[PDB]
Design a protein around this nucleic acid. Structure first.
Ligand SMILES: [Mg+2]
Length: 849
DNA sequence: AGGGTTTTT
């Protein structure tokens, strides 16, 4: 055992804390307390009974609305804005199956519609069922909900379906995504929403009584949400016989889903795309004649293959296949040469180049823009080159989607972002490197890594479709068909890679109290050891007790649309009057950073974040000052100038703001704040006290701690609480910085790519960890009295201070339990506030002189 | 000294 710095407090401070705690300790309507006890006392069958009675709206029908919409449909099918658009609808394949689909839905609770891009299932199926219900005189009974994995898709589909019915958004078709909705009319309607929206609505309507038809789309993507939803349908459907479910899938392991709901009927609907030619690396080198130079297990792979193709290819091209750099994207000039090849032959169209990540996108961009070969210099000013990356601004401009200047060919250098997330319509040629990046969590080492991996056959096939949009295209896969036969079918289902605390918590409100048994019923069951690891995190933050049952605090956390650790932080910031900065850190960790990382500008982006951090040594506070500065740029009509100069996405900033107001309104509605405004003065009287904000941040990210021991840019000898050597990620504001006031940091995410990095960190002080953490004891080890936290970091601390901080933790634990059970804003001149001031007092001792 | 991608009444 080593011993850290001294955290004993001056006697004058200790005795005012003693007086304050003693005033807290002379203290003597709860709707929330009844709801919480009611949830624990019900078994599942009485839970099912009660939800049925509380959600009964669709038990009511309006016959004059039934008959009036029945009439209006019949007449506007004689009209001529329809009767054009219905004969374009019937050119889509799905419409040929309308009647068989209507009948299969009537006879079966669950059906499955399998179709490729262009089949029209997503636009046409909901209309087929709705129009059928209106025609039969049943309009008011029908409420269709159709999920999508992505936000942009939900809106765009909804706007298109509304165009196909000659309606502005919001009468028969609507959408609903997080914090944005053009809601459809109540009945005889179709709504598109992100899968997560409907998961959040389950809390209020856990057996889906408020919809007559549920359609799940793109389930083949094996999103966490759709894998979760299908688990819950096996729980829900046996108590909802009148509910219809229509699963929808691409032709990607379609049979897994039909197997899963036990053999239910399955339609396969033809696609409409242009044919796209697949060439593998055999064919590319046979056509480009490129020449290379500047384990294996490659040749066990490549040589059996090279000889069932003896007579189909030249000798010299197959000698290139034996070089391990031939495949993938190890040689970027090879990729640059094939861009140059397509530019000369192979008539007009855009080139879409898939590379794994930021690093190789930068290389090929520099090669295409600062070419060193004569072939490239000819081509430099006849290409329009766009990098495409979630951290880059190109996606949020209109240029990459439009058609290039005359005489120039557009070339897009992109990550997997362009497979489904982003769609560009004039692409004719796909260069598929076959490599992307993926995050892999090892449960043994508790190390998450970001590694370069091969794509799956499902990826490769999606990328080939990206060329068949406007006209016949070509896909060049820079790997052999020997490499493809060693690719997996699909990527690892997202649920087996996910942290589970937040799912386990959400389930408790659906009265699914055993997560080991329930999660085992999913199409791919997560490892039970990951469930244990999720449950124990939840017991550590006291959302569950040691028998594993939900606690009043845990029920609050489960209703907040955010992972439970950062929920706890948001609630603490309500009780400790620092709401605005902490909701900002919370939103940024839940969603994204607002900073772009544009090519070539990495050194200038580093300086912008050091400037925005205001030397406060925290990536989290750094985000909040970004929001503060953003607000002032709108108050001054300098918004885009501000965003241009500092490489900020206004779109990410405005969303982060709507998340902060959504946390504020929720906390207000749960009776933890007096005002729903996250800028309210009463809610923010401590928002300028920096040592107090690092305490709240640590309360949320605990127990992810690290300790620094080195100097010199500077090099850092730092290790996390488990002993493993770490550094700050170079994107972090603490990367390379020297002269820290404290050697301790908390972090949200640790990750291995070249080294073991902390992606984000805030410098914390020992006394704040001790107050809000756990694993706290007082003792003596050498002849010195100590006070520890996590029984990992031990600090010199005299006994008079130790006895008070331990006493102070005890009262803070009793305060938190009661605020969770009997939520009320903490009154500004009451008993509870005296305890808060005691903690403020202790924490202020670490302020900068 | 480095950043695959979604998403939450
Ligand atoms: Mg519902």
């Amino acid at each position: 055992i080593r011993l850290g710095c001294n955290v004993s407090a001056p006697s004058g401070v200790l005795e005012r804390v003693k007086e304050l705690m003693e005033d807290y300790s002379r203290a003597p309507d709860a709707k929330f307390q009844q709801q919480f006890r009611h949830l624990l006392s019900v078994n599942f069958e009485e839970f099912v009974a009660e939800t049925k009675e509380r959600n009964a709206d669709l038990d009511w029908v309006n016959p004059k609305l039934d008959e009036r919409l029945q009439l209006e449909l019949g007449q506007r099918q004689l009209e001529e804005n329809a009767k054009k658009r219905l004969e374009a609808r019937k050119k889509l394949p799905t419409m040929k199956y309308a009647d068989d689909i209507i009948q299969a839905v009537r006879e079966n609770q669950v059906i499955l519609i399998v179709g490729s891009t262009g089949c029209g299932k997503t636009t046409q199926v909901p209309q087929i069922l709705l129009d059928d219900a209106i025609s039969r005189g049943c309009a008011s009974s029908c409420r269709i909900i159709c999920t999508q994995p992505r936000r942009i898709s939900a809106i765009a589909i909804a706007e298109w379906v509304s165009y196909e019915r000659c309606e502005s958004l919001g009468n028969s078709v609507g959408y609903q995504i997080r914090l944005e909705s053009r809601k459809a009319r109540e009945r005889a309607s179709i709504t598109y929403c992100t899968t997560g929206v409907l998961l959040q609505q389950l809390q209020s309507d856990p057996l889906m009584h408020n919809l007559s038809v549920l359609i799940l789309d793109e389930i083949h993507e094996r999103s966490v949400e759709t894998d979760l939803l299908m688990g819950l349908l096996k729980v829900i459907l046996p108590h909802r016989p009148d509910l219809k479910v229509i699963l929808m899938s691409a032709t990607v392991r379609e049979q897994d889903f039909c197997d899963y709901f036990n053999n239910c009927p399955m339609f396969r609907i033809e696609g409409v795309m242009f044919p796209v030619k697949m060439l593998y690396l055999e064919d590319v080198l046979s056509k480009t004649n490129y020449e290379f130079q500047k384990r294996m297990k490659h040749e066990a792979m490549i040589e059996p293959y090279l000889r069932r193709i003896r007579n189909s290819y030249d000798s010299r091209v197959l000698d290139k296949l034996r070089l391990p750099e031939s495949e993938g994207c190890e040689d970027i000039d090879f990729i640059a040469d094939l861009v140059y090849y397509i530019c000369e032959n192979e008539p007009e169209g855009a080139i879409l180049v898939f590379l794994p990540g930021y690093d190789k996108i930068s290389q090929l961009y520099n090669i295409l823009d600062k070419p060193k070969t004569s072939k490239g210099q000819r081509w430099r000013d006849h290409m329009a080159v766009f990098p495409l990356h979630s951290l880059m601004q190109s996606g949020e401009q209109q240029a990459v989607f439009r058609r290039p200047p005359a005489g120039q060919r557009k070339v897009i250098i992109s990550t997997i972002i362009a497979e489904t997330s982003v769609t560009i319509d004039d692409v004719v040629y796909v260069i598929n490197s076959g490599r992307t990046k993926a995050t892999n969590y090892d449960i043994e080492t508790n190390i998450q890594s970001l590694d370069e991996v091969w794509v799956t056959k499902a990826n490769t096939q999606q990328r080939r479709g990206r060329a068949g949009r406007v006209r016949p295209g070509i896909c060049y896969n820079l790997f052999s068909r020997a490499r493809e036969d060693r690719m997996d079918d699909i990527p690892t289902p997202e649920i087996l890679r996910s942290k589970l605390e937040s799912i386990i918590l959400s389930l408790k409100l659906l009265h699914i109290d055993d997560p080991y048994r329930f999660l085992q019923t999913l199409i791919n069951a997560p490892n039970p050891e990951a469930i244990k690891m999720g449950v124990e995190l939840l017991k550590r933050i006291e959302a569950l007790d040691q028998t594993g049952t939900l606690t009043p605090l845990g029920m609050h956390l489960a209703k907040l649309p955010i992972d439970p650790q950062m929920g706890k932080m948001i609630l603490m910031s309500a009780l400790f009057c620092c709401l605005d900065p902490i909701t900002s850190a919370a939103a940024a960790l839940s969603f994204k950073s607002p900073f772009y990382s544009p090519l070539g500008k990495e050194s200038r982006v580093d300086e912008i974040k050091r400037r925005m951090a205001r030397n406060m040594r925290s990536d989290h506070l750094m985000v909040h000052n970004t929001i503060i500065a953003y607000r002032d740029s709108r108050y001054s009509h300098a918004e885009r100038d501000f965003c241009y100069k500092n490489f900020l996405s206004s779109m990410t900033l405005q969303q982060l703001e709507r998340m902060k107001n959504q946390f504020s309104e929720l906390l207000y509605n749960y009776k933890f704040l007096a005002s729903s405004n996250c800028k309210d003065a009463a809610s923010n009287k401590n928002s300028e006290k920096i040592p107090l904000l690092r305490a709240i941040i640590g309360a949320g990210l605990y127990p992810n701690m690290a300790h620094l021991r080195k100097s010199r840019r500077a090099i850092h000898t730092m290790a996390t609480d488990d002993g493993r050597r770490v550094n700050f990620h170079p994107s972090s504001v603490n990367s390379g910085e020297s002269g820290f006031d404290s050697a301790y940091f908390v972090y949200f995410q640790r990750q291995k790519s070249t080294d073991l990095f902390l992606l984000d960190s805030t410098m914390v002080f020992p006394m704040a960890l001790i107050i809000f953490g756990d694993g706290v004891e007082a003792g003596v080890t050498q002849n010195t009295p100590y006070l520890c936290v996590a029984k990992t970091y031990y600090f010199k601390c005299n006994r008079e201070t130790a006895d008070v901080v331990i006493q102070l933790r005890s009262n803070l634990e009793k305060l938190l339990l009661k605020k969770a059970l009997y939520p009320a804003p903490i009154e500004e001149n009451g008993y509870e506030k005296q305890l808060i001031k005691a903690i403020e007092l202790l924490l202020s001792l670490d302020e900068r002189l």
